[PDB]
Design a binder for these strands. Structure first.
Lengths: 147, 95, 211, 204, 52
RNA sequence: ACGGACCAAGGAGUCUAGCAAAUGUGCAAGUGUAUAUGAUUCUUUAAACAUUUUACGCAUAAUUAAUG
RNA sequence: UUUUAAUUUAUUCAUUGGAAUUUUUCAUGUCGAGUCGUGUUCUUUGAGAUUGGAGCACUAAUACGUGUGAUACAUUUCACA
RNA sequence: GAUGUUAGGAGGGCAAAUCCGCCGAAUUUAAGCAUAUAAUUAAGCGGAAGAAAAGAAAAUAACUAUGAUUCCUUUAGUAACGGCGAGUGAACAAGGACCAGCUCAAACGGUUAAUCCUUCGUUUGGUGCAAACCUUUCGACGGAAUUGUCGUU
């Protein structure tokens, strides 16, 4: 789309929109992130506050596979399984769904949200938040620890 | 963390012996060559030095022998092994 | 730099035009590979060009639950199928000497997959109506009639693919059998707290058993 | 079983017998020319433990190599350049002296033969000595051998100059696998090219 | 200088491509659009004509 | 004050990477089918078409040097 | 024209050697040395009380060993080669 | 050891886009500049193939574990390196292409080198018009080899 470019509409305007006094020189402020702490310091401090310096210790080789764990919050367990099965677990008070969250692909169960009152539900996960446990037990369910 | 060879893993994801709960499952020539080669070669000069340091037979002497073997051989375990085997030969020749 | 932008990060400070390359030939290469493997399976005369691979569990905690095709069956599972590695590598069985069967489940499941492949095999005689009983666990050669009637049948390639796992992430239990006394968070915290000292105990157990 | 005893004796190098033997042999090698053919391997056990065999086309050459590092090739110690590059004395060559030794004989002196390996033999203050095993790829005794004849086909010309001998594999970082090498594996330059080469797809 | 690494092709969303194909079929299904496209179909009995 | 003797033709904000904003479009707690495979597609076609009911990116949760 | 699949047919007599697995006993064998390694110097690396290489000095153990497990140590488990 | 216009052979040079070793800058960036960057690049020297090189774990992981090498997608502009400035920057797992494993040394074989080469002969059949070519195992001779060839694993 080179015919939509703004330069085309400055075709006979001498300065090409880049100014008559200041001109368009090449790197008049330095290259890349050159002037940080010196003459681009205001830009750096105004838009990237904590840029300079270092904090914390070093993790030499990380291996993110070790600590990878996705989280599902407590208000999505009932939405994990289909609607007619929600209905069928709802009207019947003698059965509860057992959801292996790990199989859907989450490792930890977090506690944000609201479970349905007096609706037991059993959840299997590798990790649980304490509030997630409290809510699951409060609705009459149980948290099963799995690996 | 450490596992256990028996007593299968608990289904817990964190801690000792964790994980899924699958069901686990489980001299006549060398020393002869050593003797002949020892008879024809002997001991290297630093071996002799360590031997005499051991023969001195004091706590300071054996500490010095460990230091000297460690310096001569590099690393600590190599020096410790050398001093220990030299002690063995010193006893075996002292009998 | 100016205005509110992410700080530039471009790693183009070297001579990059020399290293730029663009894959104008992706689909051409796809067609060529497909033609080559089609010609291979046409040349080898009805014998499938795929080789049987075991199914193994992916490493690390991230891919613990998933299985995939591994490289080669092990000696133990080949023996359980009654098949020496030397003879198995001549009937499209992959074998590697590095894997070890750390669990009875893996052993049994790979053995039964091997047996399924074995009984699905129909051997072609080495010498044109000189059928023999085989060797090293290789099945006995089929006869002329069964070869004739089976060569025109569609060759199943399902056993070559990684097996699809059932999806029972939904279960139903009676409300009566829910353990209301369990404390998963407490058990997690306690296990993490106690891990160090139980490593101690196992260390000492190993020391004691060493003698 | 004689080779085992020879190996264990040569494992000492500081015993009286071995010290005297090395001293006299290195004295002989000092007077002998820089690179010269020898009738038989001076260390039969080590030679045969390397690729050496006792059939017709196999040859052993003894070669001296000067010790120390070679100093920078700049005319006097001038170096017109940044201070990071002014150094001329402590420049350590990437090729080892063993590789240099096998090159000294395989480059042009015996260009018909192919370098197989080389071993130790002796040292002194100013020279390191080596013996290089060479194979004639035009002798039928090696051509017809089902083994060893892999060296006959022309993809193994001047292995010592391509860094394909054991010394070359050592100084190329190919003697260590895993995370301790990582980059060297397909060759260092090839790996660098792969790592920093950018791939663009036609349809983005 | 023109370089071979220009963005020659484009990536089109599969859903958008399917939407476009469906819409093209629908448009082919009405007489006025087929007529306005340029075809001389004044003697066709119906625009979504189908033959045995 | 500098350039311009004259005429013709050529002659200069582009290409790629990466980010954002804006707007249009599709789908939406999902979205993109990557590499690759299949398939009576093989002038065009190096494009189009497709993907046996947890690949990967981004998003869906933040915070802390960090055990978490 | 090239090759390369399926298809067609092989039958009698003979001894010569070899191979795989399975029964019953021995003996736990071998396993790459101026090499590994360590120190130091230079270089190289994302590799950081040193990633690899090289020079010099020192210079090993023998499978119960020795090498990795990305922070230098000592005592020691474990895993993997 | 020498020496041989002894017999039979090999190397040398050209060519380089891809490939393998060595050697090796500075321009440039840091708005100066010296570490850093440019770059393990350009230039220089040497060496191969239709591919080369790598390659059959002294590997990774820490899991329910994987299993030679290479390459693609990704991990990831991440862990990390850095006047911690400018800048630089991997690996494991995962999805795919392809898929192949092996032999020396060492062990064992001495009522017997059971090995190998050179030269000179013999036939076993075949496609060629021819020129030539493919198969062939019985030797004999001269040597090499026990300072170790071959067989077994």
């Amino acid at each position: 789309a080179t015919r939509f470019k703004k330069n085309r509409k400055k075709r006979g305007h001498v300065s090409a929109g880049h100014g008559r006094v200041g001109k368009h020189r090449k790197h008049p402020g330095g290259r890349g992130k050159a002037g940080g702490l010196h003459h681009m310091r205001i830009n750096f401090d105004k838009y990237h506050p904590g840029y300079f310096g270092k904090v914390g210790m070093r993790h030499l080789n990380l291996l993110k596979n070790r600590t990878y764990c996705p989280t599902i919050n407590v208000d999505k367990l009932w939405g994990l399984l289909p609607e007619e099965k929600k209905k069928e677990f709802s009207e019947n008070k003698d059965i509860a769904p057992v959801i292996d969250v790990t199989r859907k692909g989450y490792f930890k169960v977090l506690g944000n949200g609201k479970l349905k009152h007096n609706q037991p539900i059993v959840v299997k996960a590798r990790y649980f938040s304490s509030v997630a446990e409290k809510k699951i037990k409060a609705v009459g369910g149980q948290c099963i620890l799995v690996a | 963390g450490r596992k256990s060879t028996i007593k299968p893993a608990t289904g817990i994801a964190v801690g000792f012996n964790s994980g899924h709960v699958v069901t686990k499952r489980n001299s006549k020539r060398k020393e002869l060559i050593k003797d002949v080669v020892r008879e024809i070669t002997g001991f290297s000069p630093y071996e002799k030095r360590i031997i005499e340091l051991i023969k001195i037979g004091t706590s300071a002497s054996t500490k010095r022998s460990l230091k000297y073997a460690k310096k001569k051989l590099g690393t600590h375990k190599r020096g410790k092994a050398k001093r220990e085997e030299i002690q063995k030969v010193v006893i075996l020749q002292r009998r | 730099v100016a205005h509110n932008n992410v700080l530039p990060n471009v790693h183009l400070h070297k001579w990059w035009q020399r290293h730029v390359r663009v894959n104008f030939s992706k689909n051409i290469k796809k067609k060529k590979r497909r033609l080559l493997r089609e010609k291979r399976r046409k040349a080898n005369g009805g014998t499938p060009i795929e080789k049987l691979h075991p199914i193994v569990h992916c490493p690390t905690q991230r891919y613990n639950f998933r299985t995939r095709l591994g490289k080669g069956f092990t000696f133990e599972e080949l023996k359980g199928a009654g098949l020496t590695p030397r003879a198995a590598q001549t009937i499209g069985i992959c074998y590697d000497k590095r894997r070890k069967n750390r669990s009875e489940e893996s052993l049994t499941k790979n053995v039964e997959r091997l047996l399924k492949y074995k009984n699905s095999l129909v051997m072609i005689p080495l010498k044109k109506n000189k059928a023999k009983k085989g060797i090293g666990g290789i099945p006995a050669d089929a006869d002329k009639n069964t070869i004739k009637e089976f060569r025109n049948k569609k060759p199943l390639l399902s056993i070559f693919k990684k097996e699809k796992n059932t999806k029972p992430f939904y279960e139903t239990i009676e409300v009566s059998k829910i353990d209301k006394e369990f404390l998963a968070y407490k058990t997690l915290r306690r296990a993490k707290l106690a891990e160090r000292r139980k490593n101690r105990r196992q260390q000492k157990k190993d020391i004691k058993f060493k003698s | 079983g004689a080779y085992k005893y020879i190996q264990e004796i040569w494992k000492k190098k500081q015993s009286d017998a071995m010290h005297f033997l090395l001293r006299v042999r290195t004295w002989e090698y000092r007077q002998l020319p820089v690179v010269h053919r020898v009738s038989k391997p001076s260390r039969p056990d080590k030679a045969r433990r390397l690729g050496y065999k006792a059939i017709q086309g196999f040859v052993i050459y003894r070669v001296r190599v000067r010790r120390g590092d070679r100093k920078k090739r700049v005319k006097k110690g001038i170096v017109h350049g940044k201070p990071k590059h002014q150094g001329v004395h402590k420049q350590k060559s990437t090729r080892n002296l063993k590789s240099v030794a096998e090159g000294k004989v395989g480059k042009s002196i015996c260009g018909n033969l192919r370098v197989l390996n080389s071993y130790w033999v002796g040292q002194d203050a100013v020279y390191k000595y080596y013996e290089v095993i060479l194979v004639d790829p035009n002798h039928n005794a090696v051509r017809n051998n089902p083994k060893i004849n892999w060296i006959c086909n022309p993809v193994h010309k001047h292995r010592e100059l391509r860094g394909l001998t054991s010394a070359g594999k050592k100084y190329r970082g190919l003697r260590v696998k895993g995370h301790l090498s990582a980059k060297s594996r397909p060759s260092i330059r090839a790996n660098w090219k792969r790592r920093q080469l950018i791939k663009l797809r036609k349809c983005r | 200088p023109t370089k071979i690494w220009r963005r020659w092709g484009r990536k089109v969303n599969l859903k958008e491509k399917r939407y476009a194909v469906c819409s093209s079929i629908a448009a082919s299904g009405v007489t006025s659009l087929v007529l306005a496209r340029g075809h001389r179909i004044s003697h066709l009995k119906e625009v979504p004509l189908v033959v045995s």
